[PDB]
Design a protein around this ligand. Structure first.
Ligand SMILES: [Mg+2]
Ligand SMILES: [Mg+2]
Ligand SMILES: [Mg+2]
Ligand SMILES: [Mg+2]
Ligand SMILES: [Mg+2]
Ligand SMILES: [Mg+2]
Ligand SMILES: [Mg+2]
Ligand SMILES: [Mg+2]
Ligand SMILES: [Mg+2]
Ligand SMILES: [Mg+2]
Ligand SMILES: [Mg+2]
Ligand SMILES: [Mg+2]
Ligand SMILES: [Mg+2]
Ligand SMILES: [Mg+2]
Ligand SMILES: [Mg+2]
Ligand SMILES: [Mg+2]
Ligand SMILES: [Mg+2]
Ligand SMILES: [Mg+2]
Ligand SMILES: [Mg+2]
Ligand SMILES: [Mg+2]
Ligand SMILES: [Mg+2]
Ligand SMILES: [Mg+2]
Ligand SMILES: [Mg+2]
Ligand SMILES: [Mg+2]
Ligand SMILES: [Mg+2]
Ligand SMILES: [Mg+2]
Ligand SMILES: [Mg+2]
Ligand SMILES: [Mg+2]
Ligand SMILES: [Mg+2]
Ligand SMILES: [Mg+2]
Ligand SMILES: [Mg+2]
Ligand SMILES: [Mg+2]
Ligand SMILES: [Mg+2]
Ligand SMILES: [Mg+2]
Ligand SMILES: [Mg+2]
Ligand SMILES: [Mg+2]
Ligand SMILES: [Mg+2]
Ligand SMILES: [Mg+2]
Ligand SMILES: [Mg+2]
Ligand SMILES: [Mg+2]
Ligand SMILES: [Mg+2]
Ligand SMILES: [Mg+2]
Ligand SMILES: [Mg+2]
Ligand SMILES: [Mg+2]
Ligand SMILES: [Mg+2]
Ligand SMILES: [Mg+2]
Ligand SMILES: [Mg+2]
Ligand SMILES: [Mg+2]
Ligand SMILES: [Mg+2]
Ligand SMILES: [Mg+2]
Ligand SMILES: [Mg+2]
Ligand SMILES: [Mg+2]
Ligand SMILES: [Mg+2]
Ligand SMILES: [Mg+2]
Ligand SMILES: [Mg+2]
Ligand SMILES: [Mg+2]
Ligand SMILES: [Mg+2]
Ligand SMILES: [Mg+2]
Ligand SMILES: [Mg+2]
Ligand SMILES: [Mg+2]
Ligand SMILES: [Mg+2]
Ligand SMILES: [Mg+2]
Ligand SMILES: [Mg+2]
Ligand SMILES: [Mg+2]
Ligand SMILES: [Mg+2]
Ligand SMILES: [Mg+2]
Ligand SMILES: [Mg+2]
Ligand SMILES: [Mg+2]
Ligand SMILES: [Mg+2]
Ligand SMILES: [Mg+2]
Ligand SMILES: [Mg+2]
Ligand SMILES: [Mg+2]
Ligand SMILES: [Mg+2]
Ligand SMILES: [Mg+2]
Ligand SMILES: [Mg+2]
Ligand SMILES: [Mg+2]
Ligand SMILES: [Mg+2]
Ligand SMILES: [Mg+2]
Ligand SMILES: [Mg+2]
Ligand SMILES: [Mg+2]
Ligand SMILES: [Mg+2]
Ligand SMILES: [Mg+2]
Ligand SMILES: [Mg+2]
Ligand SMILES: [Mg+2]
Ligand SMILES: [Mg+2]
Ligand SMILES: [Mg+2]
Ligand SMILES: [Mg+2]
Ligand SMILES: [Mg+2]
Ligand SMILES: [Mg+2]
Ligand SMILES: [Mg+2]
Ligand SMILES: [Mg+2]
Ligand SMILES: [Mg+2]
Ligand SMILES: [Mg+2]
Ligand SMILES: [Mg+2]
Ligand SMILES: [Mg+2]
Ligand SMILES: [Mg+2]
Ligand SMILES: [Mg+2]
Ligand SMILES: [Mg+2]
Ligand SMILES: [Mg+2]
Ligand SMILES: [Mg+2]
Ligand SMILES: [Mg+2]
Ligand SMILES: [Mg+2]
Ligand SMILES: [Mg+2]
Ligand SMILES: [Mg+2]
Ligand SMILES: [Mg+2]
Ligand SMILES: [Mg+2]
Ligand SMILES: [Mg+2]
Ligand SMILES: [Mg+2]
Ligand SMILES: [Mg+2]
Ligand SMILES: [Mg+2]
Ligand SMILES: [Mg+2]
Ligand SMILES: [Mg+2]
Ligand SMILES: [Mg+2]
Ligand SMILES: [Mg+2]
Ligand SMILES: [Mg+2]
Ligand SMILES: [Mg+2]
Ligand SMILES: [Mg+2]
Ligand SMILES: [Mg+2]
Ligand SMILES: [Mg+2]
Ligand SMILES: [Mg+2]
Ligand SMILES: [Mg+2]
Ligand SMILES: [Mg+2]
Ligand SMILES: [Mg+2]
Ligand SMILES: [Mg+2]
Ligand SMILES: [Mg+2]
Ligand SMILES: [Mg+2]
Ligand SMILES: [Mg+2]
Ligand SMILES: [Mg+2]
Ligand SMILES: [Mg+2]
Ligand SMILES: [Mg+2]
Ligand SMILES: [Zn+2]
Lengths: 473, 229, 105, 33, 681, 95, 229
């Protein structure tokens, strides 16, 4: 079970389990204390649940101090499939794992059960927490790329905060040159025309109305409800009159704070865009090479934190009115629709071969499909920059282009059992009723996909086996 | 006392400079650290009455967006540095004080250049306001008031001199509040809130002070639930 | 710049070179590697490279053998699996994709 | 034979400046008569 | 071909009863083939649910047939189809063979009909396997209803139509793992089969012929039919289901009540009012918390536990035998040779454990005395006994103890000693002792819950009602679901359910939305409109308007694009409510959550706990006879398996010694583990 | 993370060598008595039930706290294998 | 007083019965209604002491999973309805009170059937407990205590009679808190917070009471900001 506050360094394990596991080490510690006279004593003392004085918990909790344990996942695919952490005894049945390493082990929380072993020899423990601990193995053995990076939620958070909005651009506000363009367009904003974030090259009135001297100054106004974190404002940082959003300004600090080397915090961060999974990933890599290993660790949780926090306030959820359908759908549909009729007339005559007809039809759809896809995003990118669903996808957060397509636009070509994709596409989106047959049609390719995973889930080491039999030495 | 009451909050303190001030206090029952840190924060950012520039008037300047010869700095950047200035009166009698300043020739007009005013002190002497060159005239009057929270220059719109210009009001001596509620273990039960808030202050007042004032404003407010009707 | 012989190219370096090739100064890159080690049942430092779990150079005594076989085993699960010696005898099915090919390879 | 089991590191000893003098003293004693 | 009846609850049972498999004899399909079989073939229409198959190695091989599916005279899954002669459709139906179906041009149920007449020129229909836009003149046959396309177990999903066929599987399978809650409750929005289910399955007790009730006992309902007869209807109090879930029949009829032929007299294990009920309707906020509902985690309002909501009664069955050893018969006596009377208490009845006794892990459930050594005494132990008291029952204590993990309150026991009435006591077995234990399982961190749309998450944090999300009007939310678990999976159905639910809450009503022929967005938007009057109307009448926060969120709302700028806060919120979202206040600070957040009535279930959930943990224990690797059994947990994949994992690291220990001290090295233990001690 | 892990890694020619030193250090830091440390007086290892870690909680957490300082000496062949255990027992009591 | 102070919160009240209790109080400075209503709500849901069933004993019943003849309801469905019952003692002297009840024959034993006890009152008279038929014996003793918060029957495990059974303790007499902060127009400026919280209570205590207690818990807590360290 996810352990939000937990630190990379550690992991939460049930004291109950701890008792059993570290029983021997516990027994002797008991003798060490007044808890028990001897071993055999300490043992019987623990033979029954109800017969344990609370002093023993303080005994286990003391033995464990310092030492660390190992955790395993269902398929142990790479070395990180096992990591070391310092236990933090906890009540309950469930084990509390850190979310960042939830990437290394392919683990969700729909019930996946992990295992745990104990390194005994002072030596085993030595190697275990030195070269096998979790916070010391950040980078992946596959790609130099970071393995422990802001995963799903954290991003979403860190993203929402660092972003800029834009609104209605009625009057031609290109203030960039006139002084009457400052006065009039500043009043018009106060009016109901020019917004706080309008297309006005040099500066939208939003930047005109507010000028913050010191950093802190910026955030206070926000706090007081004068400025949203995502709005465009001007601030005076170290020798620069930078025109960036509050949110961005803040982000700069979170990092500038995770590592007190502030200037070094600005050199490796790009506050000129919304924080994406890549942006962050990069941030992490830079932080590593540049500063230091353990320091990088700090910044990691630091991000993990604010990410989560901001996420909850951001108030992004998923209602039906979020999966917006583009108006061009019906168009792109009908257009390609009649064109389908053309292909038909062209066949009814005897021009195209039975096969030509087919391949030509699928073609059309394959195109039309890819068409709506870019259409729906264009809708979001243009009208709803902050649509729930869309934000999760663009940001490293969650959501695949194809997936989205299935919701707003439409899932179009499912293949038959064999492979020969159907001639007819699936006109509907998940937003509306994916009809009976349409559904059944989809069900076909569903099985083959599952039939593919099953035949693989069987033996996971097959490939890796061959490779270890010829590479271990 | 020895059990429940002696287990009273261990209000510990850490304050370096009249600016930063950490405050720790534990143990606390389930979710109280939050119930405390939050309101106090709200107070520390709005209630703590303070002082700051609310209006400015320049010699020959009429508009906020103008430039003064011999003066590198621009009206907007100067009215900005003013927001940085921190003053301090000593008694209710001072609601609104107008500090005067007039400097000419090659000089770096700092805040210490303002003509002294009896019941007023300037915690920001060396603050940079402008760099004057040859033939640089600079005669101004900057209003100062005692208020609470943030007030956009648009909201008040002060009117001393018709050509004067309003500045955003930053009275709150507090720069920023920050409270954390990390778990702590005392014996039998582990679920224990451990509140610890960090306070920043411009200098006028001190963290400790601010906190004290804050908690009082609350206390006092809790009393208004006295006479029903 | 003069990328001294034997130096370990940082990603930053792999970035400088790509930029150079963009300008038009290099097309190939002379570099040590496992496909040419002398150490029989071994592979020395310089021929391996950087990437330990860390980013510094490889530290001696690491089980590269396994570390390799693993990094290639995990991704394997994402590839397609129609038939090992891929394709079906009919008309003209030319190549082979997904894992089936990696086997063949 | 790969990890800590590397003949490169398998043999490695640790010392204290205190014990360092102690053993040289063991050698100093080697001087007969 | 035969196994344990999956009766985790009625459904599980019913579905298992109607399940098909390929695996069998040997002259009929084995494990080498399947890629063409495991595929949902075309003819698998109204004959086999396309999604009902398991999830994993066994796919397509084992599948449960569709609802209307019926095996005629010889194993040919048929399906109903109504005859439509000319542009005229008939209320007559023909159960067509899979083969004969090819022969005709059938159309779907979702075709505008004026009764007997078809309503559109170009109307869908499906020839043998293919979709074809046909003319009303060619439509010979038609599909009875959506429901015939899928199984019974699938047809219970609300808006299946809006759910990816892949995740709907998780849903259908999830229900089979539904544990009956003491607090049954039918979903706020049903599909329309719940009644028929409990009924066709034998969940609740129905009335034969009309009459009046005579007695209403917590054990029996003797009714009086108006035919001059009266019969006693016992009610299986708290019987043991194969899987451990309770099965009681709580009467819902009062004393002396004229009953309508075929009307519930008692409910099923999990039947609200003759309606199926396998989870509990529960208000839900659907946002992200402080990482607590991370990738698939879920946060629970302690309030849900205050009410015995997700609590489930479980009955385990322990058993021990008195074996006949050549060293001396194992005696079943209240004599536990070595240490305390304190531990003997509950063993009251000389041997057996007393009824109504709370047995915690470790306690004695039944005493047993076998004989010590293999054939000879012990010279070492001989001196010891003599020392303090030579004379001693030189016997071993192999008594049935409460396995680690947990134990509840005994509620029944069975003893089969000599002079067996008519039982089959195995050879050697002198006598057996069964002891049934029951425990009230309350919702706790680590437990897993899942809606019918496939959203399967585990409880990660029980929060105090004190600070979790609360609506303007006091009422706090029960559960908080992260949203990032919904775009990826493609099951908007749950969102569509949450919304309708929001209405049903303030509208105080439950709805029924059929599979493909159910509620529709505008209709939902409508009921919500009705709801806003209940929720906000009273707010206007009770004496107050809108908060400073309420208006605050409204700004950031219009700037978002949800509320038509200009219009009044009251009007704005209505629009914003109609959208399925509302303003929530962070119960921790009192501030609002910038941005309207949807909330609603979502049906959620608790998943059964397999024996694996029993947090295993072995320190030291037995060891197999032949190979010398650890082994568990009755009490001591088995050692975890350390396989090659993991070996490598270690190999990868410089974890040399660590790997050796796993191969020596911890499992195989006899002299090792021994020396190891002591060394540690 | 753990104290100056980097600093440590730098003091060694090989990653894996470091782990051997601390291990062996922690070994003798117990065996020959725990008062075999090179650092103790003022600010050294400590725990919180009381400041009791001054006696024997984590062995290697000491080895590292020491090795991070410039008092210890590690080599491939620094001191003759057998004569070491002999001299250490003579000077360090605690048994 | 006449100006600023006389403009003190007009704590008005409107309460019916001992359950519902509205509370209004205005004017209030910028965003204070929130700063107040929230903590108070947190307190009113957690801190406030109450009363509820903590242990039950039935005539011939030994465990909670049993069934009593002539009694439709099952032991577990009954111990459940008991949690619903709300009592109210009037002074500290009553820490633990055991209400007795014994009914037979065709009758709907409601909470009003408990034998009266001096300093104790029952706000839940008509509360349903069971429906007895012919020859339905029902003699029981249900313990009742004064506590705070939620206590799982597993946590306390009361021991009156060996055959007795522990029930989950739900103490918070408060059923639900709610507070609104609607703007209030008063001559001068408009931005004025008007806090008004609605409290529900099982009957044991009263809204007004609860509120008073709440605010105190806070005050007392604020006192913990006394001795620095
Ligand atoms: Mg005892
Ligand atoms: Mg403990
Ligand atoms: Mg330690
Ligand atoms: Mg991940
Ligand atoms: Mg993994
Ligand atoms: Mg995962
Ligand atoms: Mg999952
Ligand atoms: Mg999973
Ligand atoms: Mg292992
Ligand atoms: Mg880590
Ligand atoms: Mg998330
Ligand atoms: Mg414009
Ligand atoms: Mg223009
Ligand atoms: Mg110009
Ligand atoms: Mg103008
Ligand atoms: Mg206008
Ligand atoms: Mg207007
Ligand atoms: Mg723009
Ligand atoms: Mg403003
Ligand atoms: Mg702007
Ligand atoms: Mg800077
Ligand atoms: Mg900071
Ligand atoms: Mg520093
Ligand atoms: Mg620092
Ligand atoms: Mg710096
Ligand atoms: Mg910057
Ligand atoms: Mg919309
Ligand atoms: Mg939305
Ligand atoms: Mg179309
Ligand atoms: Mg084309
Ligand atoms: Mg668009
Ligand atoms: Mg456009
Ligand atoms: Mg546009
Ligand atoms: Mg696409
Ligand atoms: Mg297929
Ligand atoms: Mg079609
Ligand atoms: Mg269609
Ligand atoms: Mg559609
Ligand atoms: Mg459609
Ligand atoms: Mg649609
Ligand atoms: Mg549909
Ligand atoms: Mg194989
Ligand atoms: Mg707590
Ligand atoms: Mg101007
Ligand atoms: Mg200018
Ligand atoms: Mg200038
Ligand atoms: Mg300036
Ligand atoms: Mg004053
Ligand atoms: Mg004055
Ligand atoms: Mg003033
Ligand atoms: Mg802290
Ligand atoms: Mg304890
Ligand atoms: Mg602090
Ligand atoms: Mg001070
Ligand atoms: Mg101080
Ligand atoms: Mg280089
Ligand atoms: Mg070129
Ligand atoms: Mg080479
Ligand atoms: Mg070699
Ligand atoms: Mg694979
Ligand atoms: Mg992939
Ligand atoms: Mg190594
Ligand atoms: Mg000598
Ligand atoms: Mg000498
Ligand atoms: Mg010699
Ligand atoms: Mg000599
Ligand atoms: Mg089963
Ligand atoms: Mg055969
Ligand atoms: Mg076959
Ligand atoms: Mg297959
Ligand atoms: Mg079918
Ligand atoms: Mg038949
Ligand atoms: Mg048949
Ligand atoms: Mg017709
Ligand atoms: Mg017709
Ligand atoms: Mg007919
Ligand atoms: Mg076909
Ligand atoms: Mg025709
Ligand atoms: Mg699918
Ligand atoms: Mg039926
Ligand atoms: Mg009977
Ligand atoms: Mg009925
Ligand atoms: Mg029910
Ligand atoms: Mg029911
Ligand atoms: Mg969360
Ligand atoms: Mg128990
Ligand atoms: Mg023998
Ligand atoms: Mg006999
Ligand atoms: Mg038996
Ligand atoms: Mg979940
Ligand atoms: Mg909803
Ligand atoms: Mg419909
Ligand atoms: Mg429908
Ligand atoms: Mg309609
Ligand atoms: Mg709507
Ligand atoms: Mg709340
Ligand atoms: Mg809100
Ligand atoms: Mg054994
Ligand atoms: Mg065993
Ligand atoms: Mg096991
Ligand atoms: Mg030994
Ligand atoms: Mg350390
Ligand atoms: Mg050095
Ligand atoms: Mg020493
Ligand atoms: Mg000292
Ligand atoms: Mg102590
Ligand atoms: Mg002590
Ligand atoms: Mg000390
Ligand atoms: Mg050294
Ligand atoms: Mg030195
Ligand atoms: Mg030598
Ligand atoms: Mg010796
Ligand atoms: Mg010597
Ligand atoms: Mg009144
Ligand atoms: Mg109560
Ligand atoms: Mg009695
Ligand atoms: Mg019953
Ligand atoms: Mg008394
Ligand atoms: Mg008294
Ligand atoms: Mg009567
Ligand atoms: Mg009565
Ligand atoms: Mg009362
Ligand atoms: Mg009766
Ligand atoms: Mg008793
Ligand atoms: Mg209520
Ligand atoms: Mg006013
Ligand atoms: Mg206002
Ligand atoms: Mg009540
Ligand atoms: Mg009062
Ligand atoms: Mg101090
Ligand atoms: Zn080489």
């Amino acid at each position: 079970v996810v352990g939000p506050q937990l630190k990379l360094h550690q992991c939460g394990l049930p004291k109950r389990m701890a008792l059993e596991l570290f029983k021997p080490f516990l027994l002797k510690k008991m003798e060490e204390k007044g808890i028990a006279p001897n071993v055999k004593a300490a043992r019987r003392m623990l033979e029954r649940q109800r017969d344990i004085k609370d002093e023993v918990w303080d005994a286990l909790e003391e033995v464990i101090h310092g030492k660390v344990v190992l955790l395993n996942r269902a398929p142990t695919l790479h070395r990180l499939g096992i990591q070391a952490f310092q236990p933090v005894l906890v009540e309950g049945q469930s084990i509390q794992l850190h979310p960042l390493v939830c990437e290394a082990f392919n683990a969700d929380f729909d019930g996946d059960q992990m295992a745990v072993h104990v390194p005994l020899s002072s030596f085993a423990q030595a190697e275990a927490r030195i070269q096998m601990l979790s916070a010391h193995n950040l980078l992946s053995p596959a790609s130099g790329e970071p393995l422990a990076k802001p995963s799903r939620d954290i991003i979403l958070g860190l993203y929402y905060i660092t972003q800029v909005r834009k609104e209605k651009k009625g009057a031609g506000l290109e203030f960039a040159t006139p002084e009457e363009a400052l006065a009039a367009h500043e009043r018009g904003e106060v009016a109901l025309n020019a917004p706080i974030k309008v297309a006005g090259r040099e500066t939208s009135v939003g930047r005109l109305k507010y000028v913050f001297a010191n950093p802190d100054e910026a955030l206070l106004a926000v706090a007081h409800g004068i400025v949203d974190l995502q709005d465009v404002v001007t601030v005076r940082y170290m020798g620069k009159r930078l025109e960036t959003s509050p949110g961005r300004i803040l982000f700069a600090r979170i990092v500038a704070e995770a590592v007190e080397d502030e200037k070094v915090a600005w050199e490796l961060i790009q506050l000129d865009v919304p924080q994406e999974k890549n942006s962050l990933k990069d941030l992490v890599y830079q932080a590593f090479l540049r500063l230091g290993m353990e320091k990088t660790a700090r910044l990691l949780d630091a991000l993990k934190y604010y990410g989560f926090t901001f996420s909850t306030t951001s108030g992004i959820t998923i209602g039906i009115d979020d999966a917006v359908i583009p108006e061009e759908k019906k168009q792109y549909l009908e257009e390609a629709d009649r064109k389908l009729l053309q292909i038909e007339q062209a066949y009814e005559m005897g021009f195209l071969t039975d096969r030509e007809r087919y391949d030509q039809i699928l073609q059309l759809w394959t195109e039309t499909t890819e068409k709506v896809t870019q259409a729906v995003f264009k809708n979001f990118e243009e009208n709803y920059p902050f649509n729930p669903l869309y934000v999760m996808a663009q940001s490293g957060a969650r959501g695949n282009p194809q997936q989205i397509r299935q919701l707003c636009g439409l899932r179009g070509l499912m293949q038959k059992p064999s492979g020969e994709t159907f001639e007819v596409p699936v006109r509907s989106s998940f937003r509306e009723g994916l009809t009976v047959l349409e559904y059944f049609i989809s069900s076909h390719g569903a099985r083959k996909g599952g039939a593919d995973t099953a035949l693989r889930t069987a033996d996971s080491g097959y490939l890796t086996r061959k490779l270890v039999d010829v590479t271990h030495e | 006392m020895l059990d429940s009451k002696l287990k009273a909050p261990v209000f510990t303190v850490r304050t370096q400079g009249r600016e930063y001030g950490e405050f720790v206090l534990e143990p606390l029952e389930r979710g109280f650290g939050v119930t405390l840190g939050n309101p106090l924060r709200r107070i520390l950012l709005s209630s703590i009455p303070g002082t700051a520039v609310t209006s400015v008037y320049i010699e020959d300047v009429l508009h906020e967006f103008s430039t003064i010869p011999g003066v590198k700095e621009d009206v907007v950047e100067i009215i900005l540095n003013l927001k940085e200035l921190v003053v301090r009166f000593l008694n209710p009698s001072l609601q609104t004080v107008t500090l005067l300043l007039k400097a000419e020739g090659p000089k770096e007009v700092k805040a210490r250049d303002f003509l002294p005013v009896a019941d007023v002190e300037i915690m920001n002497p060396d603050l940079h306001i402008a760099t004057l060159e040859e033939g640089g005239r600079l005669n101004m009057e900057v209003r100062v008031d005692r208020g609470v929270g943030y007030v956009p220059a648009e909201k008040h719109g002060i009117k001393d001199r018709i050509n004067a210009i309003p500045v955003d009001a930053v009275f709150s001596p507090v720069r920023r509040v920050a409270f954390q509620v990390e778990d702590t273990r005392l014996g039998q039960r582990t679920d224990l809130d451990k509140l610890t808030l960090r306070i920043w202050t411009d200098g006028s007042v001190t963290p400790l002070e601010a906190l004290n004032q804050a908690v009082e404003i609350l206390r006092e407010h809790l009393t208004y639930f006295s006479n029903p009707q | 710049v003069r990328l001294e012989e034997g130096r370990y190219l940082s990603m930053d370096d792999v970035h400088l070179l790509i930029k150079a090739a963009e300008a038009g100064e290099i097309q190939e890159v002379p570099v040590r590697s496992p496909l040419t080690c002398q150490t029989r049942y071994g592979v020395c430092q310089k021929c391996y490279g950087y990437d330990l779990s860390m980013a510094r150079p490889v530290s001696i005594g690491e089980a590269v053998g396994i570390v390799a076989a693993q990094s290639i085993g995990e991704p394997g699960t994402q590839l397609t699996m129609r038939t090992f010696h891929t394709g079906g005898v009919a008309g003209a099915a030319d190549i082979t994709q997904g894992l089936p090919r990696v086997i063949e390879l | 034979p790969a990890g800590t089991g590397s003949d490169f590191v398998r043999f490695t000893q640790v010392v204290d400046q205190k014990t360092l003098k102690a053993i040289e003293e063991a050698r100093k004693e080697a001087v007969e008569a | 071909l035969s196994q344990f009846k999956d009766e985790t609850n009625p459904l599980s049972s019913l579905r298992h009863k109607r399940r098909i498999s390929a695996l069998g004899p040997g002259g009929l399909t084995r494990e080498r083939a399947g890629f063409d079989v495991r595929d949902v073939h075309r003819t698998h229409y109204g004959r086999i649910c396309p999604v009902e198959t398991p999830e994993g190695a066994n796919i397509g091989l084992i599948t449960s047939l569709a609802a209307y599916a019926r095996v005629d005279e010889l194993g040919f899954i048929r399906t109903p189809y109504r005859r439509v002669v000319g542009g005229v459709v008939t209320d007559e139906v023909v159960y067509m063979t899979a083969t004969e179906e090819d022969r005709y041009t059938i159309a779907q149920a979702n075709t505008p009909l004026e009764g007997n007449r078809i309503a559109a020129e170009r109307v869908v229909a499906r020839r043998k396997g293919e979709p074809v836009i046909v003319s009303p003149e060619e439509v010979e046959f038609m599909d009875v209803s959506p429901k015939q396309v899928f199984s019974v177990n699938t047809n219970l999903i609300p808006f299946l139509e809006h759910d990816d066929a892949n995740r709907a599987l998780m849903g259908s399978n999830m229900q089979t793992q539904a544990v009956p809650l003491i607090r049954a409750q039918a979903p706020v929005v049903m599909t329309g089969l719940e009644e028929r289910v409990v009924r066709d399955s034998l969940a609740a007790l129905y009335a034969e012929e009309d009459g009046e009730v005579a007695k209403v006992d917590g054990n029996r309902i003797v009714v009086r039919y108006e035919d001059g007869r009266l019969v006693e209807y016992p009610l299986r109090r708290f019987y043991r289901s194969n899987q451990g879930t309770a099965l009681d029949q709580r009467p819902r009829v009062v004393v002396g009540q004229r009953v309508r032929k075929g009307d519930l007299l008692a409910d099923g294990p999990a039947s609200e009012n003759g309606f199926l009920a396998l989870g509990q309707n529960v208000l839900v906020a659907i946002m992200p918390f402080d990482g607590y509902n991370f990738e698939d985690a879920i946060v629970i309002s302690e309030e849900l536990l205050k009410r015995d909501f997700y609590t489930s009664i479980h009955i385990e069955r322990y058993e021990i035998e008195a074996r006949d050893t050549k060293l001396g018969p194992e005696r079943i006596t209240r004599d536990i040779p070595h240490l305390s009377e304190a531990a003997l208490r509950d063993l009251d009845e000389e041997g057996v454990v007393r009824i109504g006794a709370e047995v915690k892990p470790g306690d004695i459930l039944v005493g047993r005395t076998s004989f010590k050594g293999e054939s000879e005494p012990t010279p070492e132990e001989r001196l010891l006994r003599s020392i303090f008291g030579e004379k001693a029952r030189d016997v071993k204590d192999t008594s049935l103890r409460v396995p680690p993990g947990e134990g509840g309150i005994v509620v029944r026991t069975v003893r089969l000693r000599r002079g067996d009435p008519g039982v089959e006591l195995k050879p050697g077995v002198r006598e057996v002792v069964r002891v049934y234990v029951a425990q009230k399982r309350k919702l706790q961190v680590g437990d897993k819950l899942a809606n019918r749309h496939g959203n399967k998450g585990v409880v990660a944090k029980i929060l105090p009602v004190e600070d979790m999300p609360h609506l303007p009007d006091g009422t706090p939310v029960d559960v908080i679901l992260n949203p990032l678990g919904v775009p990826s999976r493609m099951n908007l159905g749950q969102i569509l359910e949450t919304h309708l639910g929001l209405a049903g809450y303030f509208l105080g009503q439950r709805y029924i939305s059929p599979i493909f022929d159910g509620a529709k967005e505008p209709e939902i938007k409508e009921l919500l409109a009705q709801a806003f009057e209940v929720y906000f109307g009273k707010r206007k009448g009770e004496g107050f308007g809108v908060d400073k926060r309420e208006v605050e969120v409204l700004r950031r709302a219009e700037k978002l694009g949800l509320v038509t700028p200009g219009k009044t806060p009251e009007e704005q919120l209505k629009e914003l409510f109609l959208q399925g979202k509302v303003v929530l206040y962070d119960g921790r600070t009192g501030e609002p959550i910038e941005g309207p957040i949807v909330v609603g009535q979502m049906f959620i279930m608790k998943l059964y706990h397999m024996v694996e959930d029993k947090m295993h943990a072995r320190s030291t224990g037995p060891y197999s006879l032949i190979t010398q690797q650890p082994l568990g059994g009755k009490a001591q947990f088995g050692g975890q398996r350390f396989g090659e994949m993991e070996v490598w994992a270690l190999e990868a690291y410089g974890a040399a010694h660590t790997l050796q220990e796993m191969l020596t001290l911890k499992s195989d090295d006899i002299e090792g583990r021994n020396a190891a233990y002591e060394a540690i001690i | 993370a753990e104290p100056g892990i980097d600093k440590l890694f730098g003091m060694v020619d090989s990653k894996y060598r470091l782990t051997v030193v601390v291990a062996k250090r922690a070994q003798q830091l117990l065996r020959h008595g725990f008062k075999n440390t090179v650092l103790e007086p003022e600010e050294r290892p400590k725990m919180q039930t009381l400041e009791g870690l001054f006696d024997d909680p984590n062995a290697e957490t000491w080895a590292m706290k020491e090795l991070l300082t410039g008092r210890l000496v590690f080599g491939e062949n620094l001191v003759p294998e057998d004569r070491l255990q002999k001299e250490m027992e003579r000077i360090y009591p605690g048994e």
